[PDB]
Scaffold this active site. Structure first.
Site, PDB file in Angstrom:
ATOM      1  N   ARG A 109      -2.951 -13.412   3.766  1.00 13.07           N
ATOM      2  CA  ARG A 109      -4.146 -12.599   3.848  1.00 13.07           C
ATOM      3  C   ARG A 109      -4.215 -11.793   5.150  1.00 13.07           C
ATOM      4  O   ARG A 109      -4.122 -12.384   6.233  1.00 13.07           O
ATOM      5  CB  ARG A 109      -5.369 -13.536   3.791  1.00 13.07           C
ATOM      6  N   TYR A 144      -9.891  -6.700  13.267  1.00 13.38           N
ATOM      7  CA  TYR A 144     -11.098  -7.351  13.778  1.00 13.38           C
ATOM      8  C   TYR A 144     -11.577  -6.654  15.040  1.00 13.38           C
ATOM      9  O   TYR A 144     -10.752  -6.288  15.892  1.00 13.38           O
ATOM     10  CB  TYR A 144     -10.752  -8.814  14.170  1.00 13.38           C
ATOM     11  N   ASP A 163     -21.139 -22.614   4.777  1.00 10.95           N
ATOM     12  CA  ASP A 163     -19.797 -22.292   4.359  1.00 10.95           C
ATOM     13  C   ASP A 163     -18.768 -23.396   4.491  1.00 10.95           C
ATOM     14  O   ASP A 163     -17.599 -23.072   4.220  1.00 10.95           O
ATOM     15  CB  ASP A 163     -19.280 -21.065   5.159  1.00 10.95           C
ATOM     16  N   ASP A 188     -18.733 -19.850  13.340  1.00 15.67           N
ATOM     17  CA  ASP A 188     -17.945 -18.712  13.779  1.00 15.67           C
ATOM     18  C   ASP A 188     -18.503 -18.078  15.055  1.00 15.67           C
ATOM     19  O   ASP A 188     -19.724 -18.053  15.257  1.00 15.67           O
ATOM     20  CB  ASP A 188     -17.895 -17.661  12.658  1.00 15.67           C
ATOM     21  N   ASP A 198     -23.429 -17.747   6.701  1.00 20.16           N
ATOM     22  CA  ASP A 198     -22.237 -17.727   7.565  1.00 20.16           C
ATOM     23  C   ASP A 198     -22.684 -17.074   8.885  1.00 20.16           C
ATOM     24  O   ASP A 198     -22.433 -15.901   9.134  1.00 20.16           O
ATOM     25  CB  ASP A 198     -21.141 -16.922   6.917  1.00 20.16           C
TER      26      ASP A 198
HETATM   27 CO   LIG Z   1     -18.544 -19.408   9.165  1.00 20.66          CO
HETATM   28 CO   LIG Z   2     -14.392 -19.574  10.770  1.00 23.18          CO
END
Ligand SMILES: [Co+2]
Ligand SMILES: [Co+2]
Ligand SMILES: [Co+2]
Ligand SMILES: [Co+2]
Ligand SMILES: [Co+2]
Ligand SMILES: [Co+2]
Lengths: 282, 282
Positions: free
Chosen positions: A78, A89, A115, A120, A152
């Site tokens: 991916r 990114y 998630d 994150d 998320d």
């Molecule tokens: Co996340």
């Molecule tokens: Co992550």
């Protein structure tokens, strides 16, 4: 003292990066503490993906000691596509060790289950980071992405070593010193999977970045979710490897795990298909 | 077939890239024909700087056979800085050989002398190019940049091999298939030397991208200037090295200049200072 151990070539299925402490592999998910300085809220961030790269690397929840590997879909590596005006990114992207987005709980704020991964982190400083790096950051704020179906959260943070860190204390300072970066962040996370044939994502709170204090609570809610998970407690913690070589009051301690990891065998990066160069106008 | 001859490591002062034909160096300014297909207005572009890079690599006008060498400022390697939301150059960047922005006359469109270099080309296709690459492109339009007060037109072009080449015939097609790119191109060239301590550049025509027919006329003008220059007839050729190995009717023809070039001696790319990572918010 954290270093990395690389196995294979970057941009291949066999690529793995483990985090080592004084030369021995530990788990990147459970062995590196959430706090570097609890009293001052200085966190350790494990970096997965350097700014301006495409390979979707991620701490793997399913392998022993949770190495960073490239994500795959139906066997294929991916890569996130370039979405104009962005390249790859647009932050150094990673996560905080010792956090979890509980997949079994509907969040009050967002109306969606977590998630199932560590929380994150977007690190906005000037220097491009490296996969597997352990850097110390301060949390500035947080955004609530709904990544089609689930909550998320993205923490906005900055390396304490960045020349601007002393002037960046809350989410308003990001607006002042990095004008347009929050708007770009909103845009990027909305459209980044469009090139892959997924729908646009949405944000709770009409896309606003919540402040440091809201950020620290959420961070705490996820690390307490992490606590239940690691202690055997959980209606569903299934599929996650919990071996740790540093932390005993859980069943899964094994110093032999540290030694069962192959020695480093880093090869030169493998070439990436030229299609990943393409800029998508969406 | 054109290939490249690299001397040294990229991102070092000793780095040089000569273009070769049949494994022998030729001048990258004078000996590559402007046209690959005169009747269809297909041009040969010399690529200097790949998209999303920073090193300001240029054909060297004053060196024999005009190899591409990184520019320097007060002796140090010059790197264009990252200007948010962009990463380095946002196009494959180079020039058309056998062209010259004559610095000895004021150009009527901009009321300014030329910048003394081959006319510059922005190649917008999806594949990232390489330094010293000769590719074949079609001209789509042109923008009248006044770069630090000098006429410095920027031709908009596309590699004929790009998948979209057959659909791109004139400048309006760039807005259709690459929405936002021309506006971002105006912003990039306006702001890119601000991090260098220079003022904001400007454009004639309010930044309008003139069409293909206008572009061909300006490219013609710059080819006509170069023909004067290469014949030894410019009123001031500024110390440009006019050595060439393919134009027997010029006073500076010399087939032996090719043989005087050292052999290839490539080294692995050298590291770039981490300061070049920095993202500037103008
Ligand atoms: Co996340
Ligand atoms: Co992550
Ligand atoms: Co220049
Ligand atoms: Co130029
Ligand atoms: Co210029
Ligand atoms: Co120029």
């Amino acid at each position: 003292t954290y270093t990395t151990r690389q196995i294979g070539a970057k941009n291949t299925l066999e690529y793995k990066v483990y985090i080592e402490k004084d030369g021995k592999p530990v788990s990147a998910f459970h062995d590196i503490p959430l706090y570097a300085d609890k009293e001052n809220n200085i966190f350790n961030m494990v970096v997965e993906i350097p700014r301006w790269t495409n390979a979707k690397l991620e701490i793997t929840k399913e392998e022993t000691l949770n190495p960073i590997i490239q994500d795959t879909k139906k066997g294929k590596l991916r890569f996130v596509r370039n979405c104009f005006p962005h390249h790859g990114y647009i932050h150094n992207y990673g996560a905080f060790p010792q956090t979890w987005e509980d997949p079994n709980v509907s969040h009050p704020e967002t109306k969606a289950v977590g998630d199932n991964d560590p929380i994150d982190v977007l690190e906005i400083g000037e220097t491009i980071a490296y996969t597997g790096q352990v850097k110390q950051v301060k949390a500035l704020g947080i955004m609530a992405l709904l990544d089609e179906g689930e909550t998320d959260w993205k923490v906005i943070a900055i390396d304490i070593n960045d020349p601007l860190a002393p002037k960046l204390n809350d989410i308003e300072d990001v607006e002042k010193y990095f004008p347009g970066l929050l708007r770009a962040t909103n845009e990027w996370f909305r459209i980044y999977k469009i090139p892959d044939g997924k729908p646009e994502n949405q944000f709770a709170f009409s896309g606003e970045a919540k402040n440091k204090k809201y950020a620290l609570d959420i961070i705490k809610e996820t690390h307490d979710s992490w606590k239940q998970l690691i202690a055997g407690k959980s209606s569903d913690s299934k599929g996650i490897d919990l071996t740790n070589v540093t932390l005993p009051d859980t069943p899964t301690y094994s110093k032999a795990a540290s030694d069962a990891i192959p020695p480093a065998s880093p090869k030169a990066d493998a070439p990436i298909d030229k299609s990943i160069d393409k800029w998508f106008f969406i």
